[PDB]
Design a protein around this motif. Sequence first.
Motif, PDB file in Angstrom:
ATOM      1  N   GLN C 146      16.870  33.151   2.736  1.00  0.00           N
ATOM      2  CA  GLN C 146      15.582  33.995   3.242  1.00  0.00           C
ATOM      3  C   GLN C 146      16.169  35.369   3.928  1.00  0.00           C
ATOM      4  OE1 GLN C 146      13.959  34.707   6.160  1.00  0.00           O
ATOM      5  NE2 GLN C 146      12.294  35.845   5.182  1.00  0.00           N
ATOM      6  N   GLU C 150      15.938  39.414   3.776  1.00  0.00           N
ATOM      7  CA  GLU C 150      15.128  40.318   4.577  1.00  0.00           C
ATOM      8  C   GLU C 150      16.039  41.479   4.858  1.00  0.00           C
ATOM      9  OE1 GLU C 150      11.746  40.380   6.610  1.00  0.00           O
ATOM     10  OE2 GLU C 150      11.712  38.190   7.059  1.00  0.00           O
TER      11      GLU C 150
ATOM     12  N   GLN D  56       2.389  47.083  -7.844  1.00  0.00           N
ATOM     13  CA  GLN D  56       2.762  48.680  -8.720  1.00  0.00           C
ATOM     14  C   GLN D  56       3.295  49.369  -7.434  1.00  0.00           C
ATOM     15  OE1 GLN D  56      -1.141  50.743  -7.801  1.00  0.00           O
ATOM     16  NE2 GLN D  56      -0.744  51.751  -9.805  1.00  0.00           N
ATOM     17  N   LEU D  60       6.464  52.226  -7.512  1.00  0.00           N
ATOM     18  CA  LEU D  60       6.642  53.571  -6.934  1.00  0.00           C
ATOM     19  C   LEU D  60       7.023  53.433  -5.596  1.00  0.00           C
ATOM     20  CD1 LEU D  60       3.224  55.030  -6.320  1.00  0.00           C
ATOM     21  CD2 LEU D  60       3.435  53.310  -8.188  1.00  0.00           C
ATOM     22  N   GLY D  61       8.179  52.672  -5.184  1.00  0.00           N
ATOM     23  CA  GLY D  61       9.031  53.023  -4.043  1.00  0.00           C
ATOM     24  C   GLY D  61       8.960  51.735  -2.850  1.00  0.00           C
ATOM     25  N   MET D  62       7.846  51.130  -2.751  1.00  0.00           N
ATOM     26  CA  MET D  62       7.612  50.135  -1.710  1.00  0.00           C
ATOM     27  C   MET D  62       8.691  49.187  -1.713  1.00  0.00           C
ATOM     28  SD  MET D  62       4.127  48.762   0.182  1.00  0.00           S
ATOM     29  CE  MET D  62       3.366  50.370   0.219  1.00  0.00           C
ATOM     30  N   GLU D  63       8.903  48.862  -0.465  1.00  0.00           N
ATOM     31  CA  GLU D  63       9.947  47.780   0.035  1.00  0.00           C
ATOM     32  C   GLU D  63       9.440  46.187  -0.590  1.00  0.00           C
ATOM     33  OE1 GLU D  63      13.438  48.769  -0.070  1.00  0.00           O
ATOM     34  OE2 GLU D  63      13.341  46.921   0.938  1.00  0.00           O
ATOM     35  N   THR D  65       9.468  43.603   1.040  1.00  0.00           N
ATOM     36  CA  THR D  65       9.185  43.204   2.238  1.00  0.00           C
ATOM     37  C   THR D  65       7.898  43.531   2.729  1.00  0.00           C
ATOM     38  OG1 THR D  65      10.825  42.128   3.934  1.00  0.00           O
ATOM     39  CG2 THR D  65       9.884  44.304   4.434  1.00  0.00           C
ATOM     40  N   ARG D  66       7.552  45.065   2.597  1.00  0.00           N
ATOM     41  CA  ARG D  66       6.412  45.499   3.196  1.00  0.00           C
ATOM     42  C   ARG D  66       5.505  45.113   2.294  1.00  0.00           C
ATOM     43  NH1 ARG D  66       7.564  51.379   4.691  1.00  0.00           N
ATOM     44  NH2 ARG D  66       8.317  50.566   6.721  1.00  0.00           N
ATOM     45  N   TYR D  69       4.342  41.731   3.533  1.00  0.00           N
ATOM     46  CA  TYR D  69       3.406  41.589   4.547  1.00  0.00           C
ATOM     47  C   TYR D  69       2.025  42.042   4.137  1.00  0.00           C
ATOM     48  CZ  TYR D  69       7.726  40.906   7.286  1.00  0.00           C
ATOM     49  OH  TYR D  69       8.984  40.499   7.794  1.00  0.00           O
ATOM     50  N   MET D  70       1.854  43.164   3.304  1.00  0.00           N
ATOM     51  CA  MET D  70       0.422  43.409   2.958  1.00  0.00           C
ATOM     52  C   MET D  70       0.001  42.322   2.356  1.00  0.00           C
ATOM     53  SD  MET D  70       0.962  47.363   1.587  1.00  0.00           S
ATOM     54  CE  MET D  70      -0.851  47.511   1.227  1.00  0.00           C
ATOM     55  N   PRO D 132       8.348  37.185   4.415  1.00  0.00           N
ATOM     56  CA  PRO D 132       8.590  37.601   3.014  1.00  0.00           C
ATOM     57  C   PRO D 132       9.559  36.885   2.108  1.00  0.00           C
ATOM     58  CG  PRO D 132       8.962  39.302   4.677  1.00  0.00           C
ATOM     59  CD  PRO D 132       8.964  38.058   5.396  1.00  0.00           C
TER      60      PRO D 132
ATOM     61  N   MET E  79      -3.362  47.393   6.494  1.00  0.00           N
ATOM     62  CA  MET E  79      -3.034  47.609   5.204  1.00  0.00           C
ATOM     63  C   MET E  79      -2.623  48.739   4.844  1.00  0.00           C
ATOM     64  SD  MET E  79      -4.732  44.511   3.288  1.00  0.00           S
ATOM     65  CE  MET E  79      -5.537  44.581   1.780  1.00  0.00           C
ATOM     66  N   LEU E  82       0.666  50.508   6.403  1.00  0.00           N
ATOM     67  CA  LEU E  82       1.791  50.172   5.860  1.00  0.00           C
ATOM     68  C   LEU E  82       1.877  50.995   4.819  1.00  0.00           C
ATOM     69  CD1 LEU E  82       1.825  46.482   6.482  1.00  0.00           C
ATOM     70  CD2 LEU E  82       3.505  47.720   7.654  1.00  0.00           C
ATOM     71  N   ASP E  86       4.816  53.791   4.501  1.00  0.00           N
ATOM     72  CA  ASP E  86       5.794  53.704   3.269  1.00  0.00           C
ATOM     73  C   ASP E  86       5.895  55.195   2.536  1.00  0.00           C
ATOM     74  OD1 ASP E  86       7.269  51.600   1.472  1.00  0.00           O
ATOM     75  OD2 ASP E  86       6.045  52.805   0.205  1.00  0.00           O
ATOM     76  N   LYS E  90       9.251  57.854   2.664  1.00  0.00           N
ATOM     77  CA  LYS E  90       9.603  58.414   1.484  1.00  0.00           C
ATOM     78  C   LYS E  90       9.721  60.081   1.399  1.00  0.00           C
ATOM     79  CE  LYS E  90       7.542  58.210  -1.997  1.00  0.00           C
ATOM     80  NZ  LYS E  90       6.528  58.503  -3.454  1.00  0.00           N
ATOM     81  N   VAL E 106       5.136  42.009  11.306  1.00  0.00           N
ATOM     82  CA  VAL E 106       4.542  43.070  10.164  1.00  0.00           C
ATOM     83  C   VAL E 106       4.226  44.513  10.951  1.00  0.00           C
ATOM     84  CG1 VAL E 106       2.111  43.515   9.454  1.00  0.00           C
ATOM     85  CG2 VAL E 106       2.879  41.142   9.448  1.00  0.00           C
TER      86      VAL E 106
END
Lengths: 230, 226, 231, 227, 220, 230
Positions: C146, C150, D56, D60-63, D65-66, D69-70, D132, E79, E82, E86, E90, E106
């Motif tokens: 894990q 991360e 999706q 187009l980019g997002m980690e 991990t993030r 969490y979403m 995650p 939501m 974040l 992100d 970028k 988070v």
Amino acid sequence: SGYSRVLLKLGGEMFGGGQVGLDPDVVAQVARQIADVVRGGVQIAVVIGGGNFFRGAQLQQLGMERTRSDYMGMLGTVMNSLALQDFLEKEGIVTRVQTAITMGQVAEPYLPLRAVRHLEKGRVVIFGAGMGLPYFSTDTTAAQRALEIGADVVLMAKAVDGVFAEDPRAELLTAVSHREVLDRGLRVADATAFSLCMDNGMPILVFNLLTDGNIARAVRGEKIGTLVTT
Amino acid sequence: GYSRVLLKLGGEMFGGGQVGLDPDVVAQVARQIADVVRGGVQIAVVIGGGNFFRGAQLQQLGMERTRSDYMGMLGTVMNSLALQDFLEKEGIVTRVQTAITMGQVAEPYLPLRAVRHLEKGRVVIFGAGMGLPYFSTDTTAAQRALEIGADVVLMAKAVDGVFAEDELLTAVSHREVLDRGLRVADATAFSLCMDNGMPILVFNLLTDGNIARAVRGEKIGTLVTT
Amino acid sequence: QLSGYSRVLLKLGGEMFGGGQVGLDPDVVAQVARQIADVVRGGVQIAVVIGGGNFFRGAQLQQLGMERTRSDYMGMLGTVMNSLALQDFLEKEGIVTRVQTAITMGQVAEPYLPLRAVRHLEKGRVVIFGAGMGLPYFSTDTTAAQRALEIGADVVLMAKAVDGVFAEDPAELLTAVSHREVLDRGLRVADATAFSLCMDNGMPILVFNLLTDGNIARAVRGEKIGTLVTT
Amino acid sequence: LSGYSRVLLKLGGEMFGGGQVGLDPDVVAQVARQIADVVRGGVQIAVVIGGGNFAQLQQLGMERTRSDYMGMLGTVMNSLALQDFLEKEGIVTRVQTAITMGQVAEPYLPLRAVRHLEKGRVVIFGAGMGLPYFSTDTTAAQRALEIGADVVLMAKAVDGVFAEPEAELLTAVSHREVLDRGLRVADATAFSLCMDNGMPILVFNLLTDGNIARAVRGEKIGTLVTT
Amino acid sequence: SGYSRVLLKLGGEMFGGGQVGLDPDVVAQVARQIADVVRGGVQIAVVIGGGNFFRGAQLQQLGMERTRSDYMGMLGTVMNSLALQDFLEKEGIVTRVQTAITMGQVAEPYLPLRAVRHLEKGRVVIFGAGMGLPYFSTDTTAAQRALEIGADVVLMAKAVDGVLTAVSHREVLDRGLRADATAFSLCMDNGMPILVFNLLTDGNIARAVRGEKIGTLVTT
Amino acid sequence: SGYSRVLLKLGGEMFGGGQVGLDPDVVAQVARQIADVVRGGVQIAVVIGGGNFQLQQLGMERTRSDYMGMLGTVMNSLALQDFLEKEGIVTRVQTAITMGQVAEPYLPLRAVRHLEKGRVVIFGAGMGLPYFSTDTTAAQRALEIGADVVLMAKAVDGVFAEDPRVNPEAELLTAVSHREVLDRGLRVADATAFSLCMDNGMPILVFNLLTDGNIARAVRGEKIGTLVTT
Ligand SMILES: Nc1nc2c(ncn2[C@@H]2O[C@H](COP(=O)(O)OP(=O)(O)OP(=O)(O)O)[C@@H](O)[C@H]2O)c(=O)[nH]1
Ligand SMILES: Nc1nc2c(ncn2[C@@H]2O[C@H](COP(=O)(O)OP(=O)(O)OP(=O)(O)O)[C@@H](O)[C@H]2O)c(=O)[nH]1
Ligand SMILES: Nc1nc2c(ncn2[C@@H]2O[C@H](COP(=O)(O)OP(=O)(O)OP(=O)(O)O)[C@@H](O)[C@H]2O)c(=O)[nH]1
Ligand SMILES: Nc1nc2c(ncn2[C@@H]2O[C@H](COP(=O)(O)OP(=O)(O)OP(=O)(O)O)[C@@H](O)[C@H]2O)c(=O)[nH]1
Ligand SMILES: Nc1nc2c(ncn2[C@@H]2O[C@H](COP(=O)(O)OP(=O)(O)OP(=O)(O)O)[C@@H](O)[C@H]2O)c(=O)[nH]1
Ligand SMILES: Nc1nc2c(ncn2[C@@H]2O[C@H](COP(=O)(O)OP(=O)(O)OP(=O)(O)O)[C@@H](O)[C@H]2O)c(=O)[nH]1
Ligand SMILES: O=c1ccn([C@@H]2O[C@H](COP(=O)(O)OP(=O)(O)O)[C@@H](O)[C@H]2O)c(=O)[nH]1
């Protein structure tokens, strides 16, 4: 040949200077004095009491458990710390407050490693809300914080500029040992606070802080007040 | 008789030692705390963490005092969780409150909660010391005992009591322990007790029924009152 | 593009900590600190996960009559003992080391903040992830998987007591196998759950013997020792 | 009939919007009513929902991990929606979240979760495991084990697992068998967890009303993986 | 004139289209606009609404407690935060997300003193989870955060160009012009300026932060 | 037509009487009034201000000043708690700022639970947010717990019909609507707090707690003070 970092202990009663709450003149004197120390190069943490915020009391001889009155004191200490921070900041001195009980919004949490980091940047650190525990005096909070931060000495701000050999109904000592203080039959601090210091060899320095210029001299290692040692 | 007590043990008692955790000792000790409770006594417990250190290597070897302290405090919790199990098995509802908040592992330190637990007929084990370095298990025991309004600090040793000096004494004042010249407990721990008039009974837990002997008022190991 | 692995999750077993016996043998810990230090100085980024067998599994105590969940936390507390010890030694090696615990233990160490752990890594500090993931019914190997995930580790380094994954319980030592091949040639036990997690995210695993001095350095160097599991 | 004292029901988040973004109030009311069937039959029930109804983004980019969490936050919104609908059906329900979220819900505390279940309350577990890379399947497993559940009920959209014309649906299979070629009842991590602990899994069709209540009585429903 | 630092309030109900959910073409376009403001040397904090995750007000109509709705919205705002974070990263903009409800790893705790520190470092700060309290609107969260970070103006992002070009706080009360009542009182009692402007028309954020005559200003 | 649960707002100044800190006469008096209500079967939460412990008119930064106040309100809470308890009433203190041993976390659902057991809940530390009045903290918490009314203790037993600075011989109101309060410049609570209430149909009842029996009258539905309803 003086001190590199120190922990300064103020009584709560000092901040009200008799009477109840905060005398912003008294606290100004104290900020100004603490600034002289910072500019002298020395690193300083402060532990303050909370007595100035009840009559008193009054609360206890009057119903209240020690446990609850101690928590009120702790909250007092944190009011004292914020006031002092504010006077130190108007003095050009960058200051941080960490609280034993974490009070997220109000101040930083008690993390001695982060406190040391602060000291090393020429910031004053103030330690509020005692140890977060009933039955321990400010003195004992002072001793233990001095240890955690690795202070060279605990500076005890009294109204008497030292420790008298015997009660004067008499000269005050310049320097005595820990055993001498205990061994018949003196009183520098609360016995518990003194034990912590003694078992760890923490020097205590009893002196009057409101005598203008004292602390800056004290920290230069300049024989003022009474230095307890071993 | 004692109505509610703080029972203190050095971590090494739980070693039967030997180092680490001996289950027959935890068992034995939970068995006896279980008797004291079924008798109607309320019992808070405080264990040290010394049984998880090989004598004192790493302390010698150069660990920061503060970091040793924290290792010990983790030790206390491992002992606390252990004792909890053996008491629950003994039929006795047990809570563990840690001075260092460890979410799922135990409850936080809540003195009023703990008292309410005690008066509901549960045992409360206080763990992680006070979360503050430069304080011993005996000091944790003293403070905790004062917070929860305990009648006495029971100090379970592997010795019959306090002597003078290696002539085992039976009753002394707090004052009398200072002037010459004994060790009942830590210097700092003793002061807290004395400054508050808190009794301390030092006895040998290695002989069976001794905790029962201690609480019901039987004389004695060494009692210290002022 | 540099050679070998750039950042690495080193999984160390707690029994190897250890002795021998219950608790901590500082000679072992000191030896491991030195090898890690050499690797770190050269600019490899290392995060460490340590086991707790020298104190408790598990799992073990569940069998003995104890409550599993309780017993798991004892094991996780045991891993924080180990984590502080290794920290002390790495420091004495001149290596700045930070311990992040899954179970916040305020006074004792830092909370688990992975973006901050990566900042630590980027500053040349070692980070020791203790208290496992803080979740009962899991092992330190799964923690290792894990956490590798991360922090975007290049590989999990499984430093065991034997020199890799052998084909069949004992030869031969397999130098290179697939994650799949492991269940196909049923090459238990690297911990199924931990393995599945690495398999589901294409996380390479290198199983190797740490007992031969200098082996960690070889692992990190992309040098062929033990068993590399990909995918 | 055998049947289960205590169960953990797993629901995909996507079902809650099905199949539009956000929350479908009918679906959530339909789920609530089935859960209330379970509490009516005297069975203790904890629920784990996913959060897909609000990757999706990864495209187009997002980690990852993030993004994870979403989803975790989505699961808590779903938990809150189901709580509300259960309360309407007269079922007392508590929500515990993996990551503490203060006044929005209770901290995750397994012993208090079972205390609720014993009092006849529904507990809903949100925010996955707060980490995650773990699937909702895996959370369900881990939570089921922590609360001493008798089974993991995998709410699914097909009646269970077949050997397929028409052919036989598999009523009861061993863990070893599912694995020994070659079916997925949970993802490998989730599945591995259950197998190392003897935890049963019952894959069934939540859509048919009466089913979960039939399952928990011990009626032959879907596909039971034992153990 | 200029604004040295500004708090930008975004209705969630625009991060979606709306439709319901997240529209990345709209979030990316907003990140873009914010990036200019940062590059041009301004310090900016963002407060976002959560309404794009709701389906009309279906739930509230079906008998949901406000308490519980508001909590759903807060999680909504985290939501969106974040997503924005992100999209800002970028764009080379270093961004931090503080949540009024503390949410472990988070995002960061709400700690306005470090918010100001993040700002001073060039970072963008996004505040999520409202104020962590029900019965308080996004506008009110906007006002308070603006006050706590010592912002110079509350930039009120809108779909309409403004309300009119410049008025006082009392004039708005007098005439009857429309932000949320409770939000507006917080600003009036502290003399906080409010710039209602049309985030939609491109380059419009970069205009406001350079003191340009845009939308409506409620400086008293 | 009485009230089932109520949120009582108390000004800090109150507790001073009218010096600095705590007057245990004033607090005992307030405690008993509240104890009359609880004994009556009515459910009551309390929100206390912090004035009893001007300094912002000394440089102190707003944010920091507000935290001073909040800390004061926790002190007040603990003091009232001690008096209520010795009046036989079981009472819990919840702080917006989390303070471990000192009090409980702010957790409204849990607060309601306390009210149902016939316990008093005292909400301390404001809402832990600077730039927000005590009135606002009372308006917000009233809504959180599903209060029927905000009871608003003032030494003047009502709201004047006009400001006395415009009409010296006004003249108290008995009943008004929220709109009637808004148009005009009636004076019930500060602007922020009145908006919360009006927008949520929350009634506010302004009355003088310090005359014995007055709170008991209020909660029963007797004609007492000024009642604002829409
Ligand atoms: N780890 C941890 N466990 C907790 C905490 N608070 C409560 N528990 C556990 O919750 C379980 C049930 O107890 P509670 O919900 O507190 O209720 P109670 O006061 O014990 O009274 P009962 O309803 O009879 O159980 C116990 O096993 C407690 O240890 C906590 O803060 N941390
Ligand atoms: N500071 C602080 N005190 C607490 C907290 N929780 C409980 N207490 C105190 O603990 C004591 C006993 O309460 P509990 O055992 O937790 O149960 P309770 O909800 O207060 O009482 P019951 O619901 O009837 O069981 C009370 O006197 C509370 O004041 C807390 O989170 N923080
Ligand atoms: N026990 C404990 N220590 C902490 C915690 N947070 C920070 N520290 C310690 O504080 C010390 C000083 O570093 P920090 O203030 O954390 O910041 P840093 O980024 O590590 O140091 P810089 O390079 O100056 O930025 C380090 O030893 C940290 O490990 C915590 O939550 N718990
Ligand atoms: N947000 C939040 N709510 C909580 C928390 N703890 C308890 N509650 C809520 O408080 C309300 C009352 O529950 P508790 O006071 O904990 O006691 P209980 O679980 O109802 O126990 P009994 O009433 O005796 O059956 C419920 O709605 C809980 O969900 C918490 O940590 N966070
Ligand atoms: N979720 C969460 N993330 C945190 C928290 N604290 C720090 N981080 C993250 O960790 C990274 C920041 O590392 P820091 O070292 O603390 O940042 P800094 O203040 O600029 O100092 P340096 O980065 O060390 O130079 C960012 O990704 C933060 O978002 C926290 O409390 N919660
Ligand atoms: N109230 C509160 N303020 C905090 C806390 N932690 C940090 N701060 C404040 O945030 C402000 C900036 O602190 P940081 O972001 O941590 O930066 P720093 O630690 O002072 O050190 P550098 O930025 O490296 O110079 C300071 O005024 C701190 O008091 C906290 O836990 N609570
Ligand atoms: O996420 C985790 C990490 C570990 N542990 C416990 O910690 C113990 C010690 O770790 P491990 O078994 O992995 O030690 P090792 O085998 O590596 O020496 C385990 O047995 C578990 O009981 C746990 O419950 N959850």
